[PDB]
């Protein structure tokens, strides 16, 4: 995956209302218990999913089983490890644990090690300090592959989408409840709010009707519409700014 979450088009777990009276519903607590039950169970599953991985001619035949599960060791590195032909990651871990046993870092101070006899023999170098990066880079060179035979002579997304859609319908029904409840308590200063805001939103929707194709190619904007006053009064300003 990425380093940041993926934006997506459809909603994802919108809220549950809390202002409904519990003397009538008495059920949102139970759905709440089910939701934190799901979150706890999902926490357990995600932790376990993370922790589950935590002339005479010769015969040359390249076999079926040329396989890097058991890779050949150089005999110097075989003497340093001890095993005959084990693996590559086992080799890296064994070399690093040998270095960690012999206390060679420092008693870059932890990058530089103290080169001893066998390790200089298996690396064919003669320094005293050499960083661990190059030491484990040489492991890639010191290992050779195994020799062949030689003879000479989902539905859950849609389900969660449905639960999200249903919770949105719950939000819609709760908002339509709360409107009529607040109108039921004090009706004066919500009907005045309606008569104000409906008028203002009608003016906002009717703020765009003189910008059509054939309403601007004609002449019934510029001439005789001092009733409108909005444009053709900017021309004292727009020429003075050089736009034209």
């Amino acid at each position: 995956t990425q380093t940041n979450p993926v934006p997506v088009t459809y909603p994802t777990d919108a809220y549950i209302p809390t202002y409904l009276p519990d003397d009538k519903v008495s059920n949102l607590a139970d759905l709440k218990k089910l939701i934190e039950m799901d979150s706890r169970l999902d926490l357990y599953l995600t932790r376990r999913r993370l922790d589950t991985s935590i002339l005479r001619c010769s015969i040359t035949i390249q076999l079926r089983g040329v396989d890097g599960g058991k890779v050949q060791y150089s005999p110097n590195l075989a003497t340093l490890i001890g095993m005959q032909t084990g693996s590559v990651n086992d080799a890296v871990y064994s070399i690093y644990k040998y270095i960690l046993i012999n206390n060679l870092f420092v008693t870059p101070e932890l990058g530089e090690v103290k080169l001893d006899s066998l390790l200089q023999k298996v690396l064919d170098t003669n320094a005293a300090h050499l960083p661990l990066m190059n030491v484990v880079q040489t492991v890639n060179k010191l290992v050779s592959p195994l020799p062949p035979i030689i003879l000479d002579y989902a539905e859950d997304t849609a389900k969660l989408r449905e639960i999200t859609k249903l919770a949105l319908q719950l939000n819609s029904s709760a908002q339509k409840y709360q409107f009529f409840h607040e109108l039921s308590l004090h009706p004066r200063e919500t009907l005045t709010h309606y008569l104000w805001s409906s008028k203002q939103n009608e003016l906002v929707l009717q703020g765009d009707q003189y910008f059509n194709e054939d309403a601007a190619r004609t002449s019934d904007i510029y001439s005789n519409n001092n009733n409108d006053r909005s444009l053709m009064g900017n021309i004292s300003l727009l020429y003075s700014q050089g736009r034209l």
């Binding site: 340093l80 490890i81 001890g82 095993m83 064994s94 644990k97 046993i101």
Partner: peptide
């Protein structure tokens, strides 16, 4: 059991390295 596998396998690996360091003795006297 995950602990009692590792706490014996690491001692086995330490013994496998100490045996190589003792095989170092038997090739100095030859």
């Amino acid at each position: 059991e995950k602990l009692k596998y590792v706490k014996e396998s690491e001692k086995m690996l330490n013994d496998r390295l100490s045996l190589s360091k003792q095989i170092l003795d038997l090739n100095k006297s030859l």
